[PDB]
Design a protein around this ligand. Structure first.
Ligand SMILES: Nc1ncnc2c1ncn2[C@@H]1O[C@H](COP(=O)(O)CP(=O)(O)OP(=O)(O)O)[C@@H](O)[C@H]1O
Ligand SMILES: [Zn+2]
Ligand SMILES: [Zn+2]
Lengths: 115, 65, 196, 286, 103, 116, 240, 69, 440
DNA sequence: CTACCGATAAGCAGATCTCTCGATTGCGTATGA
RNA sequence: UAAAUCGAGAG
């Protein structure tokens, strides 16, 4: 589970070769199905993904106490600035290639690091 | 000594019995046994009105807000 | 989850009209004429009596809930279909909402545009004995925001009072889940025993 | 009785409560809430009270909601008018919050209930006994830290952030809105961007995380212990994660997540663990 | 214009509308105290036991001032009035009692 | 009933109640009567604006009674209330505007293409 | 519906179809006339004056204004006088004597005419210890009646008991009917719905109700007054 | 506890870099990001562990049952 | 300007060596402040602590022998004067000599409790001041909580804490019993010393008193023990005091207690209940009904001593009233032990004023001028610390111990024995016969 | 006048899906040593 | 290997 009440049982141990790999060679270690979010509305996990990506890239730690951001300091924009400066996608997406077909997927995949 | 249907002793403060519950012509205090004539108090009138939360009616709701 | 600059401008412009919704609803409920400033002593006394009794409080809560629900429906209709930075079918959230794969339109609107008005059991948020729905609010407040109606969205966060109200609604749901899980076995068993 | 009343703002954490039968019953304290376990010296408080314009209870001829009754730990002290009682309550709060009178302690909770129409019973109730509930808030004048309790709070105006302070309305202000939440509820990152049931689930699940219970496990004989072999501090964490020294007991790990419907084996809530990461030590425990 | 440390007036509190015959009289009982002295009143009557008391919890922290004032002259004469919580008892019923342990 | 360590009264002072209205003032213990509404006495400031019966020494100056006229109650009862100078609120000092989240400075490009 | 087969359901009501020639008017007045009105719903307040000069009891119940209450509840002043005289005084008398036994263990009141004096004397004869009586038949605004009581009995509230009697008295109520609210038509169905089940009440009023379509929320009453098959139909309807 | 040897995601050996990272932090005024860049960790997959390792082994070692306290 | 820092170097230094003076995290040990504070307040602090206050308020128990004073003679006055708890030592068998210190490390390893022996001193007085025979008994090992005043880890810095094999930053406020850690869970109850209006149908529904109104209070003794005083309402115009001494509940008219508790006339009641509100017909009528009802029901209770005598006569077996104490003394005892305990004994006038205010509040509530106070809202609640529960249980157990002593003496009298009250051999025989394992 | 028949009011009787772990088990007493 | 009660609970 993450830190947003997202349970999950490991359905299968996906071999690393069949695992989708990214442009940089990073194969993620955990897949979470995107269909969970529209009903759960845990946007905190989405924000935490790119915040952690920026933190791991820049070797820093970002505080996540509630009620630091507001309507005019959206955390998505704030961490997207850092991601763009680091050189990744401003929206947190990341080009990815299927591990079986080897071809680039239709759209850039949302990838990050979460606790 | 008197406020409503109450008669209070002016010496000690005990509650004298009702003038309709005594033999007559005087009332004796139950503590200091002082003499109070049956006169000096004859109309123990009280006025009581029911609360506004006693008769909930649709018309009353039209008299509010 | 994002929105275009024009879409955010529309949403903010419509939300700016929700400032006086609570005061207008209160003025209508208290049978007072409009234009009444929010600090009128007669309005305060009438709100006090409405809080004291249990039926006028329900009536006022229903009226204010209807008004703020009209406002949030306006925001939803104006923003959700043609206000997003990414459009269908590129918008994956909109795709899963439309295709019924998971979630729904109210979920997407809560995420992106507005979290709406909180309702625990067909009514607005409970009030203190003094007429304050929360320590942060003036006694006998006339405001949609200080009534459980939250203007935040799950993409851009919610202020602490709105967070409190949302937690309250979640608690109501959590209790009702247990009750609904508990409330069927005897009926099922007796019917099948009779009709076996 | 399980519903979340607003009177518990700042004392009982709204987020923290276990889902299930005890939902709303077995709640938790706010992380900044302290219970006064020792009786403050209320001996000299009456002496100040009579000096402030309070007629003594010995010779008063006063009762009912028509006059303000001044109590002290459940004893009648005097009888004062209503607006007067409000003035005395405000002056007592000011004197307590400032450090000048040795009599009034900071922990003395002063709950003044003003007159109303069929409201709560008016009075002026002072408390200094044990078992009280105390929360630190910032008194707007003198900018000094104050202490308030549940009884006194529900009749007070406490802005949640300094920007919301209104003129002639707000008298106090919370130090930070983050102190109305318990621990394991302040450790959830970006809690304002989540649905409340999910916050409750996360709180209930943090207590079930498989992590390091202690470090003295070679000097114990507990029947069952769960230990996470390789724990890491979160890259993203609240300011209170290291304020309580939680890094001494790491709970999980930083995993490269990917929000992508690719494998087909994870649809409802399940998830896929990379095999290579798994047998390289990801999540191992004993 | 003057303050009288020596007692010169007393005020009691029995109840509203208290009245007694002119023959009724009271006495005083003063402690050998230095500050915040307590005054005790003892009354005499044909059929009622008048007694008085003072509570040390309140009388020590406040002081009462009794004085006259000319309608057109600002001259006043302050005085020390001890306030008393005073009750009235019946002599006959005061000593009334009963058997200690019933059978 | 008389307790131990308790003395009695020996004499009193003639109170000229006739000479005229009897007043009552509830002064605090901190205030001392010397050179006597927002009147100021000593170094503090105060606000000042038949509940109890009245007694007086008799002719012999060794007995009490109820003062009256051919009972009697005090015309004006004053309760001296101590007050403090309660300060105003410096809104310009307490209501500070919000600050943006502090962006980390010196953020240099880190992502590089493979083999570069 | 299924488990208990309760014949005393919490909210029994029935559906009353209306003829297509009955508009909102001449139907709202029928609803008001058929609705139950209690004695408490027309009394503004009561001013109980007690004297012990033999314990007298002067009860003066201020009434709602005629023009509004007679239009709202379709109740006439003559009807009010009749119901109070026949029910209120008797019920108050019974309550007072029960309480005593348990304890043991405006103007124009001088110009009353011959009819008023005869009514007062008759009511005194009918009742136990009522001494005076008057009713403002001119406007239906007030009604006073002294309640001379024995001096031996101790003091009584004469407020709580009057309250309870006014609450439990009945002005004009057909049995097992509380109110007849006319809801909005569902789809061209001009329907009146009551608050209690009693089929025989509206069987007389053929003019306003088409008795051929009286369906009720009850099941036991339907079984007892319409046979088994109507009960089966209403069971299916109320479970659907 | 002790620093992981290989990288969970990719597989790069980061077990030899913990001591070097600590030395670069202590004896030199090198920020975490610059020290990780100098160490040779470019991807965030490799960076995150050496950046967020906790080293509980040292706290565990203070309780030795084989030596006098 | 980093928003947050990993503090890698500082954390690694702390793991290198623990702090030598104070714990690094002030807020980690402030979370367990309730339990530690309560436990260290039940032993240390003012007046010798809550334990000393409780054993002082417990009082004495009396029994009699076969020597024909006017009574049975040989007036035994057994009571516990002081209670002292010491940090746990180990006997190491029968070696004795110096007493080694025991630690939670070997307590947990032993799979046994972490208990320190408890010392109790009795005052065995005969004939009320003739023969005092003090003799201090150890009634077992009372379990003590960690990091408290009576624990060996009381003020040790983290360096010595890790030196004693305990933990790096142990803050435990739990108890160790049978090698299993246990914690006295917190509890939330009614706010102390506050009469709050209560509306509850369960009063009238299966309650002898007939109404759903009332004024409930939960007064706590200075030793932290509570006794509810529910002020019910009766529909006919009177109110009835209620309280529970044993597992059964008692009802008394309010005027009887109001008179017996402090001398007063029936006029002062009217003046106090009705403060200048003499035009309030509802209050005047209800007060008339109450006063006349009391006068009718009890016409022979014309004096304060007489109502006290009636109360003492009524409450004789329930309060274990020995023949030595008179009826007036028993009435004063039950009054001071039941009504408004939080105002303390010798506070009769204060209790009178409090009960009068309670009556006025009840009448105002039933008149609709006030609103019922929610017993579930935090506005009218407080929390029991758990350590105060420990003090309550200890006071009750000491009371039970004195009860067992008196019962053993009574059984000895019932059987045919020497029954001498100045014999130390008989002292040992009667004391050793009873089961006195308070620690168990 | 007095026996038979119902009509309340109080009491009596009974109701409000599977599985896994852990923990626990009484005082009183009375005679043979 | 029992049997009952309490706590943690999972769906
Ligand atoms: N095919 C589907 N499978 C699952 N959920 C679907 C769905 N189609 C729609 N939904 C939506 O999923 C949401 C919850 O559906 P439910 O049947 O209650 C499963 P749940 O486990 O109770 O959700 P939870 O994660 O909030 O606990 C609804 O909004 C529903 O519209
Ligand atoms: Zn008398
Ligand atoms: Zn790697």
């Amino acid at each position: 589970s993450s830190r947003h009440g997202q349970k999950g049982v490991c359905s299968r141990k996906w071999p690393t070769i069949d695992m989708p790999f990214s442009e940089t060679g990073i194969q993620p270690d955990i897949i979470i199905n995107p269909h969970a979010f529209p009903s759960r509305m845990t946007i905190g996990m989405f924000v935490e993904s790119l915040a952690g990506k920026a933190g791991a890239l820049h070797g820093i730690a970002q505080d996540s106490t509630p009620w630091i951001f507001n309507e005019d300091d959206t955390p998505a924009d704030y961490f997207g600035e850092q991601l763009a400066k680091a050189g990744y996608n401003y929206h947190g997406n990341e080009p990815m290639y299927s591990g079986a077909t080897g071809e680039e997927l239709r759209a850039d995949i949302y990838v990050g690091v979460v606790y | 000594s008197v406020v409503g249907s109450l008669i209070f002793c002016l010496d000690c403060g005990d509650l004298l019995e009702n003038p309709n519950a005594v033999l007559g012509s005087n009332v004796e205090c139950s503590q200091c046994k002082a003499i109070y004539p049956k006169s000096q108090f004859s109309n123990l009138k009280v006025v009581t009105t029911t609360a506004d939360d006693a008769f909930p009616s649709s018309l009353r709701a039209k008299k509010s807000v | 989850l994002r929105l275009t600059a024009e879409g955010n401008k529309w949403r903010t412009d419509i939300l700016k009209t929700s400032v006086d919704t609570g005061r207008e609803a209160a003025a209508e409920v208290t049978n007072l004429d409009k234009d009444t400033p929010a600090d009128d002593p007669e309005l305060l006394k009438r709100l006090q009596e409405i809080l004291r009794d249990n039926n006028k409080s329900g009536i006022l809560d229903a009226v204010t809930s209807s008004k703020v629900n009209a406002i949030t429906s306006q925001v939803v209709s104006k923003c959700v279909p043609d206000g997003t930075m990414k459009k269908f079918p590129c918008n994956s959230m909109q795709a899963m909402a439309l295709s019924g794969a998971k979630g729904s339109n109210v979920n997407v609107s809560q995420i992106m545009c507005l979290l709406g008005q909180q309702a625990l059991e067909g009514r607005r948020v409970p009030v203190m004995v003094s007429g304050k729905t929360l320590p942060s609010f003036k006694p006998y407040e006339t405001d949609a925001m200080a009534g459980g109606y939250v203007k935040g969205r799950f993409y851009s966060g919610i202020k602490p009072q709105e967070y409190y109200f949302h937690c309250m609604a979640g608690r109501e749901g959590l209790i009702d889940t247990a009750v609904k899980t508990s409330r069927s076995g005897y009926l099922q068993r007796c019917l099948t025993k009779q009709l076996e | 009785v399980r519903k979340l009343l607003p009177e518990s703002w700042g004392f009982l954490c709204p987020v923290h409560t276990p889902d299930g039968s005890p939902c709303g019953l077995l709640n938790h304290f706010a992380h900044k809430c302290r219970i006064s376990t020792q009786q403050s010296d209320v001996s000299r408080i009456p002496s100040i009270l009579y000096s402030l314009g309070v007629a003594p209870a010995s010779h008063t001829f006063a009762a009912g909601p028509s006059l303000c009754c001044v109590q002290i730990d459940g004893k009648i002290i005097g009888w004062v008018s209503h607006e007067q009682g409000k003035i005395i309550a405000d002056t007592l709060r000011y004197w307590k919050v400032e450090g000048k009178t040795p009599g009034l302690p900071i922990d003395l909770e002063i709950g003044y209930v003003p007159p109303s129409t069929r409201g709560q019973y008016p009075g002026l109730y002072l408390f200094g006994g044990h078992s009280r509930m105390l929360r630190p808030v910032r008194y707007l004048p003198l900018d000094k830290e104050d202490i308030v309790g549940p009884f006194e709070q529900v009749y007070m105006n406490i802005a949640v952030t300094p920007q919301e302070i209104q003129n002639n309305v707000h008298t106090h202000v919370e130090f930070t809105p983050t102190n109305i939440l318990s621990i394991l509820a302040n450790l959830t990152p970006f809690s304002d961007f989540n649905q409340s049931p999910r916050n409750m689930y996360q709180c209930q699940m943090g207590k079930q995380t498989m992590g390091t219970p202690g470090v003295a496990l070679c000097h114990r004989s507990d029947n069952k212990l769960y230990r996470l072999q390789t724990g890491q501090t979160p890259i993203v964490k609240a300011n209170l994660y290291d304020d309580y020294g939680m890094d001494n007991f790491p709970n999980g790990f930083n995993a490269v997540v990917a929000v992508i419907s690719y494998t087909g084996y994870d649809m409802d809530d399940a998830m896929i663990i990379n095999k290579s990461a798994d047998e390289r030590g990801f999540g191992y425990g004993t | 214009e003057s303050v009288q440390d020596q007692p010169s007036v007393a005020v009691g509190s029995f109840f509203k509308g208290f009245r007694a015959p002119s023959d009724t009289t009271f006495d005083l009982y003063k402690k050998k105290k230095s500050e915040k002295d307590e005054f005790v009143l003892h009354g005499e009557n044909e059929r009622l036991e008048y007694e008085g008391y003072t509570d040390s919890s309140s009388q020590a922290s406040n002081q009462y001032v009794v004085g006259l004032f000319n309608p057109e002259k600002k001259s006043i004469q302050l005085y020390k009035a001890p306030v008393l919580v005073s009750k009235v008892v019946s002599k006959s019923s005061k000593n009334l009692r009963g058997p200690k342990i019933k059978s | 009933s008389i307790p131990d360590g308790f003395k009695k009264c020996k004499h009193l002072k003639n109170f000229p109640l006739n000479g005229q209205q009897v007043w009552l003032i509830k002064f605090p213990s901190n205030v001392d009567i010397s050179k006597l509404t927002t009147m100021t006495i000593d170094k503090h400031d105060y606000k000042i604006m038949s509940n109890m019966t009245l007694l007086v020494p008799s002719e012999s100056k060794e007995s009490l009674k109820i003062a009256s006229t051919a009972p009697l109650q005090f015309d004006k009862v004053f309760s001296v209330s101590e007050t403090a100078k309660i300060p105003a609120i410096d809104y310009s000092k307490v209501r500070v505007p919000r600050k943006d989240v502090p962006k980390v400075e010196g953020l240099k490009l880190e992502h590089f293409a493979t083999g570069y | 519906i299924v488990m208990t087969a309760s014949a005393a359901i919490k909210t029994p009501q029935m559906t009353l179809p209306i003829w297509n020639d009955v508009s909102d008017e001449q139907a709202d007045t029928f609803c008001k006339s058929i609705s139950k009105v209690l004695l408490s719903e027309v009394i503004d307040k009561v001013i109980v004056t007690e004297t012990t000069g033999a314990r007298s009891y002067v009860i003066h119940m201020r009434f709602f204004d005629n023009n509004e209450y007679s239009e709202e509840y379709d109740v006439s002043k003559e009807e009010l006088q009749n119901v109070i005289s026949n029910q209120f005084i008797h019920l108050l008398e019974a309550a007072i004597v029960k309480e005593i036994k348990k304890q043991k263990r405006v103007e124009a009141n001088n110009n009353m005419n011959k009819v008023q004096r005869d009514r007062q004397s008759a009511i005194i004869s009918h009742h136990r210890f009522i001494t005076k009586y008057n009713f403002d038949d001119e406007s239906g605004k007030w009604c006073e009646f002294k309640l001379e009581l024995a001096a031996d009995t101790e003091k009584l509230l004469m407020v709580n008991i009057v309250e309870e009697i006014c609450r439990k008295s009945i002005i004009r109520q057909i049995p097992h009917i509380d109110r007849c609210v006319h809801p909005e038509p569902e789809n061209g169905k001009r329907v009146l719905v009551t608050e209690g089940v009693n089929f025989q009440a509206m069987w007389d009023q053929e003019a306003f109700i088409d008795v051929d379509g009286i369906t009720s929320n009850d099941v036991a009453a339907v079984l007892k007054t319409y046979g088994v098959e109507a009960a089966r139909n209403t069971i299916v309807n109320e479970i659907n | 506890m002790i620093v992981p040897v290989r990288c969970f995601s990719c597989g790069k050996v980061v077990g030899d870099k913990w001591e070097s990272y600590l030395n670069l932090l202590q004896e030199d005024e090198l920020d975490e990001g610059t020290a990780l860049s100098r160490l040779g960790l470019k991807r965030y997959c490799c960076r995150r562990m050496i950046l967020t390792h906790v080293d509980l082994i040292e706290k565990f070692l203070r309780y030795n049952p084989l030596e006098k306290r | 300007a980093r928003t947050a820092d990993f503090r890698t170097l500082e954390r690694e230094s702390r793991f290198i060596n623990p702090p030598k003076d104070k714990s690094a995290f002030p807020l980690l040990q402030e979370a367990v402040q309730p339990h530690i504070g309560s436990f260290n307040a039940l032993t240390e602090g003012p007046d010798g602590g809550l334990l000393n206050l409780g054993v002082k308020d417990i009082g004495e128990k009396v029994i009699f022998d076969g020597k024909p004073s006017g009574y049975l003679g040989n007036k035994l006055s057994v009571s516990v004067e002081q209670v002292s708890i010491a940090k746990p030592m180990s006997n190491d068998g029968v070696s004795s000599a110096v007493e080694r210190k025991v630690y939670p490390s070997e307590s947990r390893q032993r799979l046994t409790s972490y208990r320190g022996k408890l010392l109790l001193k009795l005052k065995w007085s005969v004939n009320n001041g003739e023969e005092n025979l003090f003799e201090v008994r150890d009634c077992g090992g009372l379990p003590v909580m960690l990091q408290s005043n009576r624990c060996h880890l009381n003020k040790m810095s983290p360096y010595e804490l890790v030196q004693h094999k305990e933990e790096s930053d142990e803050i435990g406020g739990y108890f160790i019993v049978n090698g299993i850690e246990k914690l006295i869970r917190m509890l939330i109850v009614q706010r102390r010393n506050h009469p709050m209006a209560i509306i509850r149908p369960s009063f009238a529904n299966r309650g002898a008193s007939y109404s759903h109104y009332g004024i409930q209070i939960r007064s706590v003794r200075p030793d932290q023990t509570s006794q509810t005083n529910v002020l019910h309402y009766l529909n006919d115009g009177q109110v009835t005091f209620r309280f529970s001494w044993r597992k059964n509940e008692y009802l008394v008219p309010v005027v009887m207690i109001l008179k017996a508790l402090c001398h007063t006339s029936d006029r002062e009641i009217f003046d106090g209940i009705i403060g200048n509100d003499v035009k309030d017909s509802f209050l005047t009528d209800r007060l008339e009904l109450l006063l006349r009802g009391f006068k009718k029901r009890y016409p022979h209770l014309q004096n304060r001593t007489q109502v006290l005598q009636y109360l003492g006569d009524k409450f004789r077996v329930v309060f274990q009233a020995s023949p030595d104490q008179s009826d007036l003394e028993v009435g004063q005892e039950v009054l001071d032990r039941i009504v408004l305990v939080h105002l303390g004994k010798d506070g009769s006038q204060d209790k009178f004023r409090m009960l009068l205010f309670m009556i006025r509040k009840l009448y105002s509530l039933v008149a609709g001028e006030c609103s019922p106070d929610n017993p579930d809202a935090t506005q009218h609640q407080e929390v029991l610390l758990g350590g105060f529960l420990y003090g309550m249980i200890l006071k009750e157990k000491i009371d039970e111990y004195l009860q067992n002593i008196i019962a053993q003496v009574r059984m000895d009298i019932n059987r045919g024995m020497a029954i001498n009250f100045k014999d130390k051999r008989y002292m040992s025989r009667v004391l050793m016969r009873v089961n006195e394992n308070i620690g168990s």
